[PDB]
Amino acid sequence: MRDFKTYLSVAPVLSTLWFGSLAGLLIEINRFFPDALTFPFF
Amino acid sequence: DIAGLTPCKESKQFAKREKQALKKLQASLKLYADDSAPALAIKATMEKTKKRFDNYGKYGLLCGSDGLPHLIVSGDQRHWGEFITPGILFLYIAGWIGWVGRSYLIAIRDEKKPTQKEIIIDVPLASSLLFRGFSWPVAAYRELLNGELVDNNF
Amino acid sequence: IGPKRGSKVKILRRESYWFKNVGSVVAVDQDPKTRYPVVVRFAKVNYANISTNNYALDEVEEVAA
Amino acid sequence: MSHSVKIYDTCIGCTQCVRACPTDVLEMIPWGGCKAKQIASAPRTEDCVGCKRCESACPTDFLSVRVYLWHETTRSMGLAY
Amino acid sequence: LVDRDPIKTSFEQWAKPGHFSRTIAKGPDTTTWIWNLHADAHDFDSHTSDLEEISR
Amino acid sequence: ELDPNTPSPIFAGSTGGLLRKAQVEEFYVITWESPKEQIFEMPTGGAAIMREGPNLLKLARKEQCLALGTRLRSKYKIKYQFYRVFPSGEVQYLHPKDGVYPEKVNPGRQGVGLNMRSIGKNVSPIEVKFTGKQPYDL
Ligand code: CLA
Ligand code: CLA
Ligand SMILES: CC1=C(/C=C/C(C)=C/C=C/C(C)=C/C=C/C=C(C)/C=C/C=C(C)/C=C/C2=C(C)CCCC2(C)C)C(C)(C)CCC1
Ligand SMILES: CC1=C(/C=C/C(C)=C/C=C\C(C)=C/C=C/C=C(C)/C=C/C=C(C)/C=C/C2=C(C)CCCC2(C)C)C(C)(C)CCC1
Ligand SMILES: CC1=C(/C=C/C(C)=C/C=C\C(C)=C\C=C\C=C(C)\C=C\C=C(C)\C=C\C2=C(C)CCCC2(C)C)C(C)(C)CCC1
Ligand SMILES: CCCCCCCCCCCCO[C@H]1O[C@H](CO)[C@@H](O[C@H]2O[C@H](CO)[C@@H](O)[C@H](O)[C@H]2O)[C@H](O)[C@H]1O
Ligand code: SF4
Ligand code: SF4
Structure with a gap:
């Protein structure tokens, strides 16, 4: 229903469903690794 | 190793920081949870900052006086990924913020009246020009400096 | 239509808002006579609420060409 | 100057364009060819204060006037009283 | 404004640049009108020259 | 005053208009026509009526007495007319002169619009050092 060469719109602040959430999933990485200050690698 | 002291x-x-400070976390002989199932200083908050024992990983990590750990990162003895490892990371992530900045933008100024399509958003995040960033191998590191954004357009 | 009337022109005066930028034109003057002919027009507004100005061929340096 | 703020433009046509501004501007002085043929930048300006209501409307395409007069009477500021 | 009415759309106004004083948000692009819109969003010199609604 | 009472533009009181500096220097005053008894708006905050006579209200300073237009022409009438009174006579015949309605053609009068050179590239700053022998007193 969405193929090739840009799509459908969206509101003024879907940024408030982008600050809240996405970014929100990141506390979700900041407790899985409840900590940082350098980091091991994969 | 360098200016401050040695690691862990x-x-x-x-060591003294580990101990007094946190463990006075204690400080509450009891405070009632003999069996009780809520008040969680008790379990972790300490232990999660604490079972962080004579281990924190081991990280090297220089630690000056008062033993709060300092970051050198000069690419030596041990400390390399306290800037570069999380440095290229900052670079890569940004730049694929604005590679697409210069994208769900350079895809509009055309067709028919295109004068604020941007207060609404055509493909949300761009969700089309999206991956162009991870789908940057090399990319702007050549095509930026040769053609398109070419000195012409400079 | 035969030569070029109003098909693409830069501005070069340095006072004019969209100066170095090239937008589109319209009914450029006919006669031998005056000194402020040529309407020009482009999308981008400017410091006034309404911006659709008239410059004049002593100049339009279009420039290459 | 003594009131010298340039609002001039090129059309100096004054229909659905600009009129506003306490006394100062008795123009329509048609110069021998400028479209709606009324031109220049002012009349006798030794009369009124210092607005920029002067543009706000109808082009000056460059600057637009403001206070610049310095030499400044009183009838030139409401308050000589 | 249409879109178009009076009387003779249910079809709601989602899409076509502007609204709020009449050489309105103009086709031609700008930012000021994005603090406009929120500010003076409630006001009454515009919406209609006629009491009526406003109290409604 | 009273022994000569010649009025026209009704009001009653007000701490608004005319005070000491309209004798000791200049004066300024507006006059007008009108149809039938109508209540107006006023400069200086107040508000009254009309009917006629000369319909000749006197006003502190001339930015004040043209505002009868900036509303007092959203209330019918060709004719409204302000002059300049002194403490003795004339020169400065204010709305007198020639024609009227700032947007017509009889003569040209003053104005000019140019200086020496026109709006063009005055990236050229201030020139000569101000010296009594080269046309920069205009
Ligand atoms: C997409 C984005 C974009 C890009 C590629 C740039 C790029 C640039 N900006 Mg910039 N900027 C932006 C948006 C952007 N900006 C926005 C929204 C603002 C707020 C008005 C600014 C305010 C700003 C200022 C004051 C300055 C710059 C400057 C610069 C230049 C220096 C980089 C820097 O250190 O600033 C870092 C970047 C910012 C501070 C911008 C914050 C906004 C970002 C996060 C936009 C993110 C994308 C956004 C959500 C778009 C939606 C995506 C869409 C496809 C769906 C560089 C050319 C500097 C300059 O002129 O020197 C050359 C100057 O200091 N910017
Ligand atoms: C009973 C009354 C109440 C009501 C119903 C109104 C209604 C109105 N007022 Mg009003 N007003 C009130 C009390 C009220 N006022 C009070 C107490 C004051 C004195 C401060 C004012 C001062 C005032 C002014 C100066 C103006 C109005 C205007 C208006 C009109 C515009 C409303 C609008 O668009 O929203 C405006 C609201 C916003 C744009 C939202 C922005 C709010 C910001 C500043 C946030 C506040 C800080 C807060 C801590 C931030 C949130 C937390 C954050 C840190 C995350 C509207 C008819 C305006 C007008 O033009 O009249 C037609 C005019 O601007 N009011
Ligand atoms: C965690 C981390 C990471 C991540 C990163 C990222 C990706 C990010 C981010 C974040 C971001 C990316 C942020 C940003 C933001 C932005 C901003 C915040 C902006 C702002 C703006 C401004 C502030 C402006 C202002 C102004 C203007 C507009 C102009 C002029 C005027 C003024 C000044 C007002 C990594 C891993 C990599 C590394 C490590 C750490
Ligand atoms: C090793 C090291 C170092 C070095 C440094 C140096 C030497 C620096 C300088 C630097 C520089 C000298 C820089 C500059 C460069 C140039 C340029 C020119 C850049 C750029 C750019 C651009 C152009 C970008 C763009 C973009 C992108 C890519 C993304 C998207 C879009 C945008 C726009 C954002 C340091 C210090 C860090 C420290 C330690 C480590
Ligand atoms: C209920 C309700 C309410 C309330 C509201 C509120 C109060 C809200 C708030 C909200 C909030 C209060 C929010 C906040 C947010 C914040 C956050 C979310 C934070 C963060 C973050 C992040 C995620 C980040 C991170 C990071 C890191 C890691 C480090 C640095 C960098 C960065 C920043 C990136 C009311 C009454 C109105 C009414 C209606 C309903
Ligand atoms: C009884 C005889 C009087 C009728 C006058 C003839 C005009 C007929 C249209 C109805 C009145 C006009 O508008 C009135 O009704 C509209 C629905 O129609 C309402 O709503 C709409 O109308 C407005 C214009 O008036 C639009 O600009 C508004 O954006 C819209 O919401 C208004 O809140 C109200 O002001
Ligand atoms: S309207 Fe403005 S000529 Fe035109 S800009 Fe000069 S006064 Fe009349
Ligand atoms: S701009 Fe100047 S001259 Fe014009 S009305 Fe205002 S004060 Fe008078």
Whole structure:
């Protein structure tokens, strides 16, 4: 229903469903690794 | 190793921090949860900052006086990924913020009246020009400096 | 239509808002006579609420060409 | 100057364009060819204060006037009283 | 404004640049009108020259 | 005053208009026509009526007495007319002169619009050092 060469719109602040959430999933990485200050690698 | 002291393998001052400070976390002989199922200083908050024992990983990590750990990162003895490892990371992530900045933008100024399509958003995030960033191998590191954004357009 | 009337022109005066930028034109003057002919027009507004100005061929440096 | 703020433009046509401004501007002085043929930038300006209501409307395409007069009477500021 | 009415759309106004004083948000693009819109959003010199609604 | 009472533009009181500096220097005053008894708006905050006579209200300073237009022409009438009174006579015949309605053609009068050179590239700053022999007193 969405193929090739840009799509459908969206509101003024879907940024408030982008600050809240996405970014929100990141506390979700900041407790899985409840900590940082350098980091091991994969 | 360098200006401050040595890591965790020994750091006296650092040790004292572990202990007083946190463990006075204690400080509440009891405070009632003999069996009780809520008040969670008790379990972790300490232990999660704490079972962080004579281990924190081991990280090297220099630690000065008062034993709070300092970051050198000069690419030596041990400390390399306290800037570069999380540095290229900052670069890569940004730049694929604005590679697409210069994208769900350079895809509009055309067709028919295109004068604020941007207060609404055509493909949300761009969700089309999206991956162009991870789908940057090399990319702007050549095509930016040769063609398109070409000195012409400069 | 035969030569070029109003098909693409830069501005070069340095006072004019969209100066170095090239937008589109319209009914450029006919006669031998005056000194402020040529309407020009482009999308981008400017410091006034309404911006659709008239410059004049002593100049339009279009420039290459 | 003594009131010298340039609002001039090129059309100096004054229909659905600009009129506003306490006394100062008795123009319509048609110069021998400028479209709606009324031109220049002022009349006798030794009369009124310092607005920029002067543009706000109808082009000056450059600057637009403001206070610049310095030499400044009193009838030139409401308050000589 | 249409879109178009009076009387003779249910079809709601989602899409076509502007609304709020009449050489309105103009086709031609700008930012000021994005603090406009929120500010003076409630006001009454515009919406209609006629009491009526406003109290409604 | 009263022994000569010649009025026209009704009001009653007000701490608004005319005070000491309209004798000791200049004066300024507006006059007008009108149909039938109508209540107006006023400069200086107040508000009254009309009917006629000369319909000749006197006003502190001339920015004040043209505002009868900036509303007092959203209330019918060709004719409204302000002059300049002194403490003795004339020169400065204010709305007198020639024609009227700032947007017509009889003569040209003053104005000019140019300086020496026109709006063009005055990236050229201030020129000569101000010296009594080269046309910069205009
Ligand atoms: C997409 C984005 C974009 C890009 C590629 C740039 C790029 C640039 N900006 Mg910039 N900027 C932006 C948006 C952007 N900006 C926005 C929204 C603002 C707020 C008005 C600014 C305010 C700003 C200022 C004051 C300055 C710059 C400057 C610069 C230049 C220096 C980089 C820097 O250190 O600033 C870092 C970047 C910012 C501070 C911008 C924050 C906004 C970002 C996060 C936009 C993110 C994308 C956004 C959500 C778009 C939606 C995506 C869409 C496809 C769906 C660089 C050319 C500097 C300059 O002129 O020197 C050359 C100057 O200091 N910017
Ligand atoms: C009973 C009354 C109440 C009501 C119903 C109104 C209604 C109105 N007022 Mg009003 N007003 C009130 C009390 C009220 N006022 C009070 C107490 C004051 C004194 C401060 C004012 C001062 C005032 C002014 C100066 C103006 C109005 C205007 C208006 C009109 C515009 C409303 C609008 O668009 O929203 C405006 C609201 C916003 C744009 C939202 C922005 C709010 C910001 C500043 C946030 C506040 C800080 C807060 C801590 C931030 C949130 C937390 C954050 C840190 C996350 C509207 C008819 C305006 C007008 O033009 O009349 C037609 C005019 O601007 N009011
Ligand atoms: C965690 C981390 C990471 C991540 C990163 C990222 C990706 C990010 C981010 C974040 C971000 C990316 C942020 C940003 C933001 C932005 C901003 C915040 C902006 C702002 C703006 C401004 C502030 C402006 C202002 C102004 C203007 C507009 C102009 C002029 C005027 C003024 C000044 C007002 C990594 C891993 C990599 C590394 C490590 C750490
Ligand atoms: C090793 C090291 C170092 C070095 C440094 C140096 C030497 C620096 C300089 C630097 C520089 C000298 C820089 C500059 C460069 C140039 C340029 C020119 C850049 C750029 C750019 C651009 C152009 C970008 C763009 C973009 C992108 C890519 C993304 C998207 C879009 C945008 C726009 C954002 C340091 C210090 C860090 C420290 C330690 C480490
Ligand atoms: C209920 C309700 C309410 C309330 C509201 C509120 C109060 C809200 C708030 C909200 C909030 C209060 C929010 C906040 C947010 C914040 C956050 C979310 C934070 C964060 C973050 C992040 C995620 C980040 C991170 C990071 C890191 C890691 C480090 C640095 C960098 C960065 C920043 C990136 C009311 C009454 C109105 C009414 C209606 C309903
Ligand atoms: C009784 C005889 C009087 C009728 C006058 C003839 C005009 C007929 C249209 C109805 C009145 C006009 O508008 C009135 O009704 C509209 C629905 O129609 C309402 O709503 C709409 O109308 C407005 C214009 O008036 C629009 O600009 C508004 O954006 C819209 O919401 C308004 O809140 C109200 O002001
Ligand atoms: S309207 Fe403005 S000529 Fe036109 S800009 Fe000069 S006064 Fe009349
Ligand atoms: S801009 Fe100047 S001259 Fe014009 S009305 Fe205002 S004060 Fe008078």
